[PDB]
């Protein structure tokens, strides 16, 4: 990296808007691939709303609440129609992304699976992108089937178009992933998908906070992530889908407020995106999520994107010159959105961050939610450091420092 | 018609001090409490606490674990030892989430072509279209529990409509528009009798009367944090723990396994099997302060407290010509909730009059159209009390319901 790019990293702008970093100015957080830390506008956001909007018993407010966050949310993810409109009608708030693909893999696989389709995703998917697919899977008839990655760790134009064949019907495969910091090309996903006419799904959780998301660039069919990797608070997930599909797709959970009516032995669904969300929501937290959104939006998204880019080029760097080192995923840096898992040579992952842990260093040790990749990968625990723009140089050679502690015990 | 003692002790409010909403802007008259609550300021705190100091994770992992035993023991889950069952409670997003996941397990566990769902005709909807859903998909027939003239369900109808064919029994402990509270332990020893499971909705009788699984003898039990000064997005699902070991998962995914492979999948313990995903850790957290906020003001006094409040708003509405009640006259049998109509007049119109007067009430269906199809009612109003509320809380609705009729 060049001096200037140093430079950028060494300053943090950024970190004293958490209040827990401002209060602990020696721990280096870097698990922001698990979750983030929560941008003080945001703890704040959701305590104001307990204290004057709940239930709207001020009203002599929160309903419109709630309509702008999914307004502006539809605008960050590029989720605008042709006059500038956001598409605020086609967010739906769930849990996590979780709750989003159980609710695309029942919905969407009742409507559309039939025993020999395929339905096809990556081996790089965290579980999440997994088990849902061979519930349904098992219970229509239909096959999994799995990308594969080659020496680079990509999928090649060729495995997607040997996978991706007529028997698709859904293609499910992650937008950035959460154990090797891959980016997958979802846009050339997409056209092989719709070729062969297949719904598109992109678990966008880790590609939401960390690189410029636009729906109607990525081609997709539906489209999840969760607020809290991005600077949002716990609880809050959130699906986009095309509107026509989503129409189309029957209800996930059923009960009160997605209905329109009900009688003892029926009832009428409610229209989109109420459909999607029964009982109580929680609205805190959407009123919480809209402003991590406003938040992201004033330090201006595409300069969030560089720093952390400049971040993993510098971890990926530093962790190279550790000769006891080795990175699972690729070793280029400029190849890592977010996450760059590695292992000390001959050392248990938990011996690993627990030695960090004393150094003030917060990294994640285990399996990652990705146990098919690592047994892909001969892997049977892994350590994983990931960055996020509220981080700097220093944090990065904190780690290092750290390492070569470890080295010294083992 | 009751003492001057018990009218003096809801005119005195030792409670409301702790909501900021309605401590701060004395004008607001919140009557509407069956829907949700609102939030104490140690909730709030615990909350903001949360995310500012141990967002993660041994603190908050710790957190996490102690505010299943608080809830555990708040339901009176524990076992012979008074050690709280912790790991008998499931949360969820509240309780509509809880009543899926149990319609969707244990209806694929139990249910098969020719067995009864026997729900009650006072069901909330989110304890009615589930077992719609898996009725069809399972064969089972849908059997409703139907009322008195007292808005009771008597026993010659429990023993009448729950017979041998019954798998499921979902019955609401208390009706969040009439304020019934159903005998559900007697429920329960007809259900088991006809070797059947008994399924209760909570919601309302959490927040305002003594919960105890033991006693009730159910087999699972779910409510919302969100009625009883939680945080909203968190419900609470209590089951056996040789039931819950039984039941099929939910959902699937991240956490809620022990191992995975590219074809199969082994699941990790009750409750983390049912436990999909990153979890609302923060609102968990402050659920568990909520818990130990309504253990402070004791339970019973809570109840007590409002039991007056029930009595004396049902009295007050009886003494206007214009009002009927839409449900019991007594004061005694109603839990929280009151509706009524101004006869002639559209709830929505008294709903707007209200609101202007800074009183809170709601208006519509409630969630329970069935029950209003039942009682030839096409909507109606819903005035509902809490312990911070008080008698001028209702007396400000009388005075606004005056106002509505001399309008209309
Ligand atoms: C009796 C009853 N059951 C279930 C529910 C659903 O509650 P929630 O909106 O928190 O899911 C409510 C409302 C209710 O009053
Ligand atoms: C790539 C990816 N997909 C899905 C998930 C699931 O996220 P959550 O725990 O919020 O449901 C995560 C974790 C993730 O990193």
Same mark, same amino acid.
């Given at each position: 990296?060049?001096?200037?790019?140093?430079?950028?990293?060494?300053?943090?702008?950024? #970190? /004293?808007?958490?209040?827990?970093?401002?209060?602990?100015?020696?721990?280096?957080?870097?698990?922001s691939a698990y979750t983030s830390?929560?941008?003080?506008? @945001?703890?704040?956001? %959701?305590?104001?709303?307990?204290?004057?909007?709940?239930?709207? $018993?001020?009203?002599?407010?929160?309903?419109?609440? *709630?309509?702008?966050? &999914?307004?502006?949310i539809?605008?960050?993810i590029?989720?605008?129609?042709?006059?500038? #409109?956001?598409?605020?009608?086609?967010?739906i708030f769930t849990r996590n992304t979780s709750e989003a693909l159980n609710?695309?893999?029942?919905?969407?696989?009742?409507? $559309?699976?039939?025993?020999?389709?395929?339905?096809?995703?990556?081996?790089?998917?965290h579980?999440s992108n *997994?088990?849902?697919?061979?519930?349904?899977?098992?219970?229509?008839?239909?096959?999994?089937?799995?990308?594969?990655?080659?020496?680079?760790?990509?999928?090649?134009?060729?495995?997607?178009?040997?996978?991706?064949?007529?028997?698709?019907?859904? =293609?499910?495969?992650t937008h950035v992933?959460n154990?090797?910091?891959?980016?997958?090309?979802?846009?050339?996903?997409?056209?092989?998908?719709? /070729?062969?006419?297949?719904?598109? =799904?992109v678990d966008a959780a880790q590609s939401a906070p960390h690189?410029?998301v636009?729906?109607?660039?990525?081609?997709?069919?539906?489209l999840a992530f969760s607020a809290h990797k991005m600077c949002g608070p716990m609880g809050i997930g959130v699906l986009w889908?095309?509107?026509?599909?989503?129409?189309?797709?029957?209800?996930?959970?059923?009960?009160?407020?997605?209905?329109?009516?009900?009688?003892?032995?029926? $009832?009428?669904?409610?229209?989109?995106?109420? #459909?999607?969300?029964?009982?109580?929501?929680d609205?805190?937290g959407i009123?919480?999520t809209?402003?991590a959104?406003?938040?992201?939006?004033?330090?201006?998204?595409? #300069?969030?994107?560089?720093?952390?880019?400049?971040?993993?080029?510098?971890?990926?760097?530093?962790?190279?010159?550790?000769?006891?080192?080795?990175? =699972?995923?690729?070793?280029?840096?400029?190849?890592? =959105?977010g996450?760059?898992?590695?292992?000390?040579?001959?050392?248990?992952?938990?011996?690993?961050?627990? *030695?960090?842990?004393?150094?003030? @260093?917060?990294? &994640?040790?285990?399996?990652?939610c $990705?146990?098919?990749?690592? *047994?892909?990968?001969?892997?049977?625990?892994?350590?994983?450091?990931?960055?996020?723009?509220?981080?700097?140089?220093?944090?990065?050679? %904190?780690?290092?420092?750290?390492?070569? %502690?470890?080295?010294?015990?083992?």
């Amino acid at each position: 990296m060049t001096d200037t790019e140093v430079a950028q990293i060494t300053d943090n702008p950024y #970190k /004293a808007d958490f209040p827990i970093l401002a209060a602990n100015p020696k721990v280096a957080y870097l698990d922001s691939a698990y979750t983030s830390q929560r941008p003080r506008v @945001v703890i704040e956001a %959701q305590s104001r709303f307990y204290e004057t909007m709940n239930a709207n $018993a001020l009203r002599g407010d929160a309903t419109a609440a *709630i309509e702008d966050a &999914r307004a502006s949310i539809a605008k960050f993810i590029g989720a605008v129609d042709k006059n500038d #409109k956001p598409e605020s009608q086609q967010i739906i708030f769930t849990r996590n992304t979780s709750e989003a693909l159980n609710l695309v893999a029942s919905s969407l696989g009742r409507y $559309a699976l039939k025993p020999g389709d395929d339905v096809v995703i990556s081996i790089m998917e965290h579980h999440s992108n *997994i088990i849902p697919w061979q519930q349904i899977c098992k219970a229509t008839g239909a096959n999994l089937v799995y990308l594969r990655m080659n020496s680079q760790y990509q999928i090649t134009p060729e495995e997607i178009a040997s996978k991706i064949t007529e028997r698709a019907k859904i =293609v499910s495969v992650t937008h950035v992933s959460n154990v090797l910091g891959t980016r997958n090309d979802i846009k050339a996903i997409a056209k092989r998908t719709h /070729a062969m006419g297949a719904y598109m =799904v992109v678990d966008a959780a880790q590609s939401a906070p960390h690189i410029l998301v636009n729906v109607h660039d990525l081609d997709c069919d539906l489209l999840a992530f969760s607020a809290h990797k991005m600077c949002g608070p716990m609880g809050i997930g959130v699906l986009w889908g095309r509107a026509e599909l989503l129409n189309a797709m029957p209800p996930f959970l059923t009960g009160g407020e997605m209905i329109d009516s009900v009688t003892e032995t029926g $009832a009428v669904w409610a229209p989109v995106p109420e #459909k999607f969300e029964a009982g109580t929501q929680d609205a805190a937290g959407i009123y919480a999520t809209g402003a991590a959104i406003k938040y992201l939006n004033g330090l201006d998204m595409a #300069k969030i994107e560089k720093r952390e880019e400049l971040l993993a080029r510098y971890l990926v760097q530093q962790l190279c010159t550790l000769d006891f080192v080795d990175i =699972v995923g690729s070793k280029l840096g400029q190849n890592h =959105v977010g996450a760059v898992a590695f292992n000390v040579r001959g050392v248990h992952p938990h011996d690993v961050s627990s *030695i960090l842990d004393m150094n003030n @260093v917060c990294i &994640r040790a285990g399996h990652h939610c $990705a146990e098919p990749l690592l *047994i892909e990968l001969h892997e049977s625990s892994t350590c994983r450091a990931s960055v996020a723009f509220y981080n700097d140089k220093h944090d990065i050679d %904190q780690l290092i420092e750290g390492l070569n %502690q470890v080295w010294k015990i083992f």
